[PDB]
PDB file of C-alpha atoms in Angstrom:
ATOM      1  CA  UNK P   1       0.000   0.000   0.000  1.00 21.33           C
ATOM      2  CA  UNK P   2       2.645   2.587   1.005  1.00 23.75           C
ATOM      3  CA  UNK P   3       4.341   4.217  -1.990  1.00 21.60           C
ATOM      4  CA  UNK P   4       7.315   5.547  -0.025  1.00 21.19           C
ATOM      5  CA  UNK P   5       8.962   5.480   3.406  1.00 22.29           C
ATOM      6  CA  UNK P   6       6.922   8.500   4.483  1.00 21.12           C
ATOM      7  CA  UNK P   7       3.629   6.712   3.832  1.00 19.83           C
ATOM      8  CA  UNK P   8       5.038   3.542   5.417  1.00 20.83           C
ATOM      9  CA  UNK P   9       5.786   5.482   8.605  1.00 18.66           C
ATOM     10  CA  UNK P  10       2.310   7.032   8.581  1.00 23.19           C
ATOM     11  CA  UNK P  11       0.716   3.595   8.266  1.00 21.47           C
ATOM     12  CA  UNK P  12       2.971   2.184  10.980  1.00 17.28           C
ATOM     13  CA  UNK P  13       2.051   4.990  13.380  1.00 19.60           C
ATOM     14  CA  UNK P  14      -1.647   4.334  12.811  1.00 18.99           C
ATOM     15  CA  UNK P  15      -1.116   0.605  13.331  1.00 21.29           C
ATOM     16  CA  UNK P  16       0.836   1.261  16.535  1.00 19.10           C
ATOM     17  CA  UNK P  17      -2.369   2.313  18.295  1.00 19.58           C
ATOM     18  CA  UNK P  18      -3.723  -1.219  17.803  1.00 19.14           C
ATOM     19  CA  UNK P  19      -0.534  -3.289  18.046  1.00 17.75           C
ATOM     20  CA  UNK P  20       2.835  -3.151  19.798  1.00 17.82           C
ATOM     21  CA  UNK P  21       6.001  -2.832  17.735  1.00 17.66           C
ATOM     22  CA  UNK P  22       9.011  -4.973  18.628  1.00 15.12           C
ATOM     23  CA  UNK P  23      12.542  -3.906  17.719  1.00 11.57           C
ATOM     24  CA  UNK P  24      15.984  -5.068  18.748  1.00 13.84           C
ATOM     25  CA  UNK P  25      17.625  -1.973  20.175  1.00 12.67           C
ATOM     26  CA  UNK P  26      17.075   1.191  22.149  1.00 13.18           C
ATOM     27  CA  UNK P  27      18.300   3.211  19.161  1.00 11.30           C
ATOM     28  CA  UNK P  28      15.663   1.607  16.946  1.00  9.38           C
ATOM     29  CA  UNK P  29      13.079   2.654  19.517  1.00  8.41           C
ATOM     30  CA  UNK P  30      14.525   6.179  19.564  1.00  6.17           C
ATOM     31  CA  UNK P  31      14.413   6.408  15.771  1.00  5.80           C
ATOM     32  CA  UNK P  32      10.711   5.514  15.806  1.00  8.05           C
ATOM     33  CA  UNK P  33      10.038   7.975  18.621  1.00  7.01           C
ATOM     34  CA  UNK P  34      11.152  10.819  16.344  1.00  2.00           C
ATOM     35  CA  UNK P  35       8.157  10.035  14.128  1.00  2.00           C
ATOM     36  CA  UNK P  36       5.847   9.971  17.152  1.00  2.43           C
ATOM     37  CA  UNK P  37       5.704   6.173  17.158  1.00  2.33           C
ATOM     38  CA  UNK P  38       5.918   5.341  20.863  1.00  2.00           C
ATOM     39  CA  UNK P  39       4.247   1.942  21.372  1.00  2.00           C
ATOM     40  CA  UNK P  40       7.549   0.125  20.930  1.00  2.00           C
ATOM     41  CA  UNK P  41       9.430  -2.476  22.961  1.00  2.00           C
ATOM     42  CA  UNK P  42      13.161  -3.003  22.499  1.00  2.00           C
ATOM     43  CA  UNK P  43      14.326  -6.597  23.007  1.00  2.00           C
ATOM     44  CA  UNK P  44      17.977  -6.129  23.996  1.00  2.00           C
ATOM     45  CA  UNK P  45      18.302  -6.422  27.754  1.00  2.00           C
ATOM     46  CA  UNK P  46      15.131  -8.502  28.037  1.00  2.00           C
ATOM     47  CA  UNK P  47      14.388 -12.236  28.156  1.00  2.00           C
ATOM     48  CA  UNK P  48      12.141 -13.275  25.274  1.00  2.00           C
ATOM     49  CA  UNK P  49       9.600 -14.281  27.930  1.00  2.00           C
ATOM     50  CA  UNK P  50       9.719 -10.745  29.360  1.00  2.00           C
ATOM     51  CA  UNK P  51       8.073  -9.484  26.164  1.00  2.00           C
ATOM     52  CA  UNK P  52       5.351 -12.111  26.485  1.00  2.00           C
ATOM     53  CA  UNK P  53       4.685 -11.163  30.106  1.00  2.00           C
ATOM     54  CA  UNK P  54       4.573  -7.451  29.224  1.00  2.00           C
ATOM     55  CA  UNK P  55       1.961  -8.005  26.512  1.00  2.00           C
ATOM     56  CA  UNK P  56      -0.217 -10.658  28.157  1.00  2.00           C
ATOM     57  CA  UNK P  57      -3.783  -9.446  28.551  1.00  2.00           C
ATOM     58  CA  UNK P  58      -2.912  -6.027  27.143  1.00  2.00           C
ATOM     59  CA  UNK P  59      -2.156  -6.484  23.457  1.00  2.00           C
ATOM     60  CA  UNK P  60      -3.278  -9.211  21.073  1.00  2.00           C
ATOM     61  CA  UNK P  61      -1.202  -8.156  18.077  1.00  2.00           C
ATOM     62  CA  UNK P  62       2.516  -7.552  17.660  1.00  2.00           C
ATOM     63  CA  UNK P  63       4.310  -5.882  14.764  1.00  2.00           C
ATOM     64  CA  UNK P  64       7.781  -7.386  14.265  1.00  2.00           C
ATOM     65  CA  UNK P  65      10.338  -4.827  13.100  1.00  2.00           C
ATOM     66  CA  UNK P  66      13.771  -6.400  13.347  1.00  2.00           C
ATOM     67  CA  UNK P  67      16.570  -5.473  10.955  1.00  2.00           C
ATOM     68  CA  UNK P  68      16.756  -7.196   7.583  1.00  2.00           C
ATOM     69  CA  UNK P  69      20.240  -8.606   8.131  1.00  2.00           C
ATOM     70  CA  UNK P  70      21.123 -12.130   9.292  1.00  2.00           C
ATOM     71  CA  UNK P  71      21.097 -11.110  12.953  1.00  2.00           C
ATOM     72  CA  UNK P  72      17.668  -9.520  12.615  1.00  2.00           C
ATOM     73  CA  UNK P  73      16.182 -12.415  10.650  1.00  2.00           C
ATOM     74  CA  UNK P  74      17.174 -14.929  13.341  1.00  2.00           C
ATOM     75  CA  UNK P  75      15.574 -12.803  16.053  1.00  2.00           C
ATOM     76  CA  UNK P  76      12.522 -12.226  13.867  1.00  2.00           C
ATOM     77  CA  UNK P  77      12.013 -15.970  13.426  1.00  2.00           C
ATOM     78  CA  UNK P  78      12.591 -16.701  17.106  1.00  2.00           C
ATOM     79  CA  UNK P  79      10.100 -14.083  18.272  1.00  2.00           C
ATOM     80  CA  UNK P  80       7.593 -15.005  15.561  1.00  2.00           C
ATOM     81  CA  UNK P  81       7.573 -18.604  16.800  1.00  2.00           C
ATOM     82  CA  UNK P  82       7.470 -17.608  20.473  1.00  2.00           C
ATOM     83  CA  UNK P  83       4.704 -15.033  20.171  1.00  2.00           C
ATOM     84  CA  UNK P  84       2.539 -17.246  17.985  1.00  2.00           C
ATOM     85  CA  UNK P  85       3.042 -20.120  20.457  1.00  2.00           C
ATOM     86  CA  UNK P  86       1.719 -17.877  23.238  1.00  2.00           C
ATOM     87  CA  UNK P  87      -1.427 -16.868  21.361  1.00  2.00           C
ATOM     88  CA  UNK P  88      -0.388 -13.516  19.880  1.00  2.00           C
ATOM     89  CA  UNK P  89      -1.165 -12.396  16.336  1.00  2.00           C
ATOM     90  CA  UNK P  90       2.114 -11.611  14.562  1.00  2.00           C
ATOM     91  CA  UNK P  91       2.264  -8.895  11.895  1.00  2.00           C
ATOM     92  CA  UNK P  92       5.204  -9.112   9.474  1.00  2.00           C
ATOM     93  CA  UNK P  93       3.643  -6.955   6.760  1.00  2.00           C
ATOM     94  CA  UNK P  94       5.528  -3.801   7.728  1.00  2.00           C
ATOM     95  CA  UNK P  95       8.895  -5.517   7.883  1.00  2.00           C
ATOM     96  CA  UNK P  96       8.256  -7.411   4.648  1.00  2.00           C
ATOM     97  CA  UNK P  97       7.359  -4.179   2.876  1.00  2.00           C
ATOM     98  CA  UNK P  98      10.815  -2.749   3.616  1.00  2.00           C
ATOM     99  CA  UNK P  99      12.393  -5.654   1.734  1.00  7.13           C
ATOM    100  CA  UNK P 100      11.574  -3.850  -1.520  1.00 11.84           C
ATOM    101  CA  UNK P 101      13.505  -0.716  -0.556  1.00 12.17           C
ATOM    102  CA  UNK P 102      17.137   0.042   0.175  1.00 12.76           C
ATOM    103  CA  UNK P 103      17.142  -0.405   3.932  1.00 12.71           C
ATOM    104  CA  UNK P 104      18.556  -2.980   6.325  1.00 12.09           C
ATOM    105  CA  UNK P 105      18.489  -1.367   9.768  1.00 15.33           C
ATOM    106  CA  UNK P 106      15.307   0.233  11.094  1.00 16.20           C
ATOM    107  CA  UNK P 107      17.601   2.873  12.569  1.00 12.92           C
ATOM    108  CA  UNK P 108      18.151   4.101   8.997  1.00 10.92           C
ATOM    109  CA  UNK P 109      14.771   5.854   9.061  1.00  9.60           C
ATOM    110  CA  UNK P 110      16.344   8.592  11.184  1.00  8.14           C
TER     111      UNK P 110
ATOM    112  CA  UNK C   1      48.930 -14.124  19.782  1.00  5.99           C
ATOM    113  CA  UNK C   2      50.866 -13.836  16.510  1.00  4.70           C
ATOM    114  CA  UNK C   3      47.921 -15.083  14.430  1.00  4.01           C
ATOM    115  CA  UNK C   4      44.301 -16.243  14.664  1.00  4.19           C
ATOM    116  CA  UNK C   5      45.363 -19.797  15.469  1.00  3.40           C
ATOM    117  CA  UNK C   6      47.313 -18.641  18.525  1.00  4.29           C
ATOM    118  CA  UNK C   7      44.494 -16.244  19.423  1.00  2.00           C
ATOM    119  CA  UNK C   8      42.149 -19.239  19.616  1.00  2.00           C
ATOM    120  CA  UNK C   9      44.692 -21.218  21.633  1.00  2.00           C
ATOM    121  CA  UNK C  10      45.101 -18.335  24.084  1.00  2.00           C
ATOM    122  CA  UNK C  11      41.363 -17.707  24.333  1.00  2.00           C
ATOM    123  CA  UNK C  12      40.754 -21.375  25.133  1.00  2.00           C
ATOM    124  CA  UNK C  13      43.391 -21.218  27.872  1.00  2.00           C
ATOM    125  CA  UNK C  14      41.897 -17.992  29.253  1.00  2.00           C
ATOM    126  CA  UNK C  15      38.390 -19.497  29.226  1.00  4.55           C
ATOM    127  CA  UNK C  16      39.344 -21.740  32.161  1.00  5.41           C
ATOM    128  CA  UNK C  17      39.967 -18.608  34.263  1.00  7.27           C
ATOM    129  CA  UNK C  18      37.318 -16.232  32.909  1.00  5.85           C
ATOM    130  CA  UNK C  19      33.909 -16.384  31.255  1.00  8.64           C
ATOM    131  CA  UNK C  20      33.492 -15.299  27.639  1.00  7.51           C
ATOM    132  CA  UNK C  21      30.482 -13.167  26.729  1.00 11.30           C
ATOM    133  CA  UNK C  22      29.087 -13.112  23.194  1.00 10.84           C
ATOM    134  CA  UNK C  23      25.912 -11.735  21.633  1.00 13.02           C
ATOM    135  CA  UNK C  24      24.296 -14.778  20.070  1.00 13.49           C
ATOM    136  CA  UNK C  25      23.774 -18.507  20.298  1.00 12.21           C
ATOM    137  CA  UNK C  26      25.570 -18.909  16.957  1.00 11.70           C
ATOM    138  CA  UNK C  27      28.640 -17.090  18.258  1.00  8.70           C
ATOM    139  CA  UNK C  28      28.615 -19.508  21.172  1.00  8.00           C
ATOM    140  CA  UNK C  29      28.274 -22.445  18.774  1.00  9.92           C
ATOM    141  CA  UNK C  30      31.227 -21.180  16.714  1.00  7.06           C
ATOM    142  CA  UNK C  31      33.475 -21.046  19.780  1.00 10.84           C
ATOM    143  CA  UNK C  32      32.322 -24.520  20.801  1.00 13.37           C
ATOM    144  CA  UNK C  33      33.837 -25.985  17.632  1.00 13.78           C
ATOM    145  CA  UNK C  34      37.232 -24.926  18.995  1.00  8.21           C
ATOM    146  CA  UNK C  35      36.449 -26.546  22.356  1.00  6.17           C
ATOM    147  CA  UNK C  36      35.851 -23.166  23.997  1.00  3.78           C
ATOM    148  CA  UNK C  37      32.795 -23.823  26.173  1.00  4.54           C
ATOM    149  CA  UNK C  38      32.804 -21.316  29.055  1.00  4.53           C
ATOM    150  CA  UNK C  39      30.682 -18.876  27.084  1.00  2.00           C
ATOM    151  CA  UNK C  40      27.467 -17.000  27.817  1.00  4.11           C
ATOM    152  CA  UNK C  41      25.302 -15.673  24.988  1.00  5.05           C
ATOM    153  CA  UNK C  42      23.549 -12.410  25.866  1.00  7.42           C
ATOM    154  CA  UNK C  43      20.552 -12.519  23.531  1.00  4.96           C
ATOM    155  CA  UNK C  44      17.519 -13.665  25.499  1.00  6.41           C
ATOM    156  CA  UNK C  45      18.921 -12.539  28.846  1.00  7.75           C
ATOM    157  CA  UNK C  46      18.582  -9.401  30.937  1.00  2.99           C
ATOM    158  CA  UNK C  47      21.948  -7.698  31.391  1.00  2.00           C
ATOM    159  CA  UNK C  48      21.499  -8.351  35.115  1.00  2.00           C
ATOM    160  CA  UNK C  49      21.005 -12.070  34.427  1.00  2.00           C
ATOM    161  CA  UNK C  50      24.671 -12.212  33.418  1.00  2.00           C
ATOM    162  CA  UNK C  51      25.698 -10.530  36.666  1.00  2.00           C
ATOM    163  CA  UNK C  52      23.648 -12.988  38.707  1.00  2.00           C
ATOM    164  CA  UNK C  53      25.106 -15.972  36.823  1.00  2.00           C
ATOM    165  CA  UNK C  54      28.692 -14.859  37.495  1.00  2.00           C
ATOM    166  CA  UNK C  55      28.455 -13.492  41.038  1.00  2.00           C
ATOM    167  CA  UNK C  56      30.657 -15.467  43.411  1.00  2.00           C
ATOM    168  CA  UNK C  57      31.803 -17.833  40.663  1.00  2.00           C
ATOM    169  CA  UNK C  58      33.865 -15.746  38.272  1.00  2.00           C
ATOM    170  CA  UNK C  59      35.842 -12.550  38.795  1.00  2.00           C
ATOM    171  CA  UNK C  60      36.885 -11.876  35.206  1.00  2.00           C
ATOM    172  CA  UNK C  61      34.911 -11.688  31.977  1.00  2.00           C
ATOM    173  CA  UNK C  62      36.181 -11.645  28.401  1.00  2.00           C
ATOM    174  CA  UNK C  63      34.065  -9.462  26.108  1.00  2.00           C
ATOM    175  CA  UNK C  64      33.726 -10.854  22.592  1.00  2.00           C
ATOM    176  CA  UNK C  65      30.963  -8.893  20.903  1.00  2.00           C
ATOM    177  CA  UNK C  66      31.091  -8.261  17.159  1.00  2.00           C
ATOM    178  CA  UNK C  67      32.886  -5.151  15.947  1.00  2.00           C
ATOM    179  CA  UNK C  68      29.866  -3.765  14.094  1.00  2.00           C
ATOM    180  CA  UNK C  69      27.802  -0.894  15.509  1.00  2.00           C
ATOM    181  CA  UNK C  70      25.365  -3.250  17.224  1.00  2.00           C
ATOM    182  CA  UNK C  71      28.267  -5.109  18.829  1.00  2.00           C
ATOM    183  CA  UNK C  72      30.154  -2.006  19.972  1.00  2.00           C
ATOM    184  CA  UNK C  73      27.064  -0.648  21.725  1.00  2.00           C
ATOM    185  CA  UNK C  74      26.526  -3.909  23.596  1.00  2.00           C
ATOM    186  CA  UNK C  75      30.242  -4.066  24.390  1.00  2.00           C
ATOM    187  CA  UNK C  76      30.153  -0.629  26.010  1.00  2.00           C
ATOM    188  CA  UNK C  77      26.967  -1.424  27.922  1.00  2.00           C
ATOM    189  CA  UNK C  78      28.283  -4.685  29.347  1.00  2.00           C
ATOM    190  CA  UNK C  79      31.705  -3.167  30.064  1.00  2.00           C
ATOM    191  CA  UNK C  80      30.074  -0.418  32.144  1.00  3.20           C
ATOM    192  CA  UNK C  81      27.661  -2.792  33.903  1.00  4.41           C
ATOM    193  CA  UNK C  82      30.162  -5.528  34.712  1.00 10.33           C
ATOM    194  CA  UNK C  83      32.792  -3.087  35.944  1.00  8.04           C
ATOM    195  CA  UNK C  84      30.191  -1.317  38.104  1.00  5.64           C
ATOM    196  CA  UNK C  85      29.412  -4.662  39.725  1.00  8.54           C
ATOM    197  CA  UNK C  86      33.028  -5.431  40.563  1.00  8.70           C
ATOM    198  CA  UNK C  87      34.068  -7.718  37.700  1.00  8.77           C
ATOM    199  CA  UNK C  88      37.368  -7.423  35.839  1.00  9.81           C
ATOM    200  CA  UNK C  89      36.658  -6.892  32.134  1.00  9.81           C
ATOM    201  CA  UNK C  90      39.041  -8.175  29.455  1.00 10.81           C
ATOM    202  CA  UNK C  91      38.885  -6.494  26.036  1.00 12.97           C
ATOM    203  CA  UNK C  92      42.309  -7.665  24.850  1.00 12.93           C
ATOM    204  CA  UNK C  93      41.000 -10.572  22.779  1.00 12.22           C
ATOM    205  CA  UNK C  94      38.349  -8.433  21.104  1.00  7.71           C
ATOM    206  CA  UNK C  95      40.914  -5.716  20.387  1.00  6.93           C
ATOM    207  CA  UNK C  96      43.111  -8.233  18.568  1.00  9.83           C
ATOM    208  CA  UNK C  97      40.186  -8.971  16.265  1.00  8.77           C
ATOM    209  CA  UNK C  98      39.854  -5.232  15.621  1.00  9.27           C
ATOM    210  CA  UNK C  99      43.469  -5.287  14.478  1.00  8.77           C
ATOM    211  CA  UNK C 100      42.903  -8.181  12.063  1.00  7.96           C
ATOM    212  CA  UNK C 101      39.619  -6.716  10.828  1.00  6.56           C
ATOM    213  CA  UNK C 102      37.567  -9.682  12.049  1.00  7.47           C
ATOM    214  CA  UNK C 103      34.121  -8.137  12.476  1.00  7.09           C
ATOM    215  CA  UNK C 104      32.047 -11.200  13.389  1.00  3.54           C
ATOM    216  CA  UNK C 105      32.888 -14.002  15.808  1.00  2.79           C
ATOM    217  CA  UNK C 106      30.946 -16.403  13.573  1.00  2.20           C
ATOM    218  CA  UNK C 107      33.551 -15.595  10.909  1.00  2.00           C
ATOM    219  CA  UNK C 108      36.087 -17.520  12.983  1.00  2.00           C
TER     220      UNK C 108
END
């Protein structure tokens, strides 16, 4: 749907009122904050189960936004499997959309 | 160490006296192939989980995070945390990789 990064960010912000965004680092969270996207959880420094416990009974959907490099893909797969196993709806549409553009690290949006 | 082979030999020796910290499970697996087993992977753990695992058991920790931006940030974070908690932090092995331009532990 989005034609450019600007529209992608607008759509992500709207979606963030209905689902939590998961990223790897604090800097990824900061980059999103600049675009007024605040409903974000950074994984580094947390057990995977900590994310589950934080979302339980509060959010049903999670938007996965890990980097598009090998490191990010492994984490993406791990969290996708974990969250789905715990009953959460996993949204990969936003991350998959970025695969068509020249970007690897979410931090690049800043 | 004069080369990567000796670096591995020295790291293995040092791993009997200090714990090695890496970012991922795959980095840990890579070291395991060289019979270096005293390694903790950070992904999936709270920074404080590492402190609790080492307290009273190990006094020194060898930092072996990748040299990329992601790795350097984690290296600085763990260096500051571990030192604040009383652990001796060893960056000598990692710095040798910097010298040989070895960015990822999995590359070894």
